Design a protein that fits this description.
binds adenosine-5-diphosphoribose; alpha/beta; 162 residues; globular; Leucine Aminopeptidase, subunit E, domain 1; X domain; viral protein; macro domain; Chikungunya; alphavirus
């Protein structure tokens, strides 16, 4: 039946229309800047016992609504090699949680492309790991970003696969 899809939206992920949200989290469950700022603004109870290791994800239910805290590596602290593995792992744990949760859709940002980027442009790296994990799930995936140029590039990368 229903065709699982990938979409990109340039808007605040906290305003998503999907059955769940992925927070670009930190490992201590602390409020922060960027995605986590918006997620904390809307779902602060989701931060109750959300602390989890780098490269893992941990879901906290806000009623019927899952907030998947996914912890990408900070590339200021991780080497390129070790960070690539942790980033891959975070997105794989996202896919496992999404499947487990039985959700029909998910709102997701590009992990480790903002305050955890170590100053590097990691759009293509983060998206590649996103695809590698998500591709085997049948949930509709909606990627959120804030930059116009990044929206275009993410959109192209989706479109050219098919
Ligand atoms: N409200 C938002 N909606 C959509 N996209 C956003 C939003 N805020 C930021 N972005 C974009 O989402 C991407 C992820 O950036 P971050 O949220 O900074 O996540 P990350 O790079 O994984 O760093 C996580 C760290 O940031 C802290 O705020 C958080 O507590 C953790 O310490 C970046 O490309 C960023 O430009």
């Amino acid at each position: 039946h229903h065709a699982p899809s990938y979409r990109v939206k340039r808007m605040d992920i906290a305003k998503n229309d999907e059955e769940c949200v992925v927070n670009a989290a930190n490992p201590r469950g602390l409020p922060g800047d960027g995605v986590c700022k918006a997620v904390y603004k809307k779902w602060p109870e989701s931060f109750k016992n959300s602390a989890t290791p780098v490269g893992t994800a941990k879901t906290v239910m806000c009623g019927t609504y899952p907030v998947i805290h996914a912890v990408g590596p900070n590339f200021s602290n991780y080497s390129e090699s070790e960070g690539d593995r942790e980033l891959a792992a975070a997105y794989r744990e996202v896919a496992k949680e999404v499947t487990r949760l039985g959700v029909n859709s998910v709102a997701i940002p590009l992990l480790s492309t903002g305050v955890y980027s170590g100053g590097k442009d990691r759009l293509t790296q983060s998206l590649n790991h996103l695809f590698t994990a998500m591709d085997s799930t049948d949930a509709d995936v909606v990627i959120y970003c804030r930059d116009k140029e990044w929206e275009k590039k993410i959109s192209e990368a989706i479109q050219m696969r098919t």
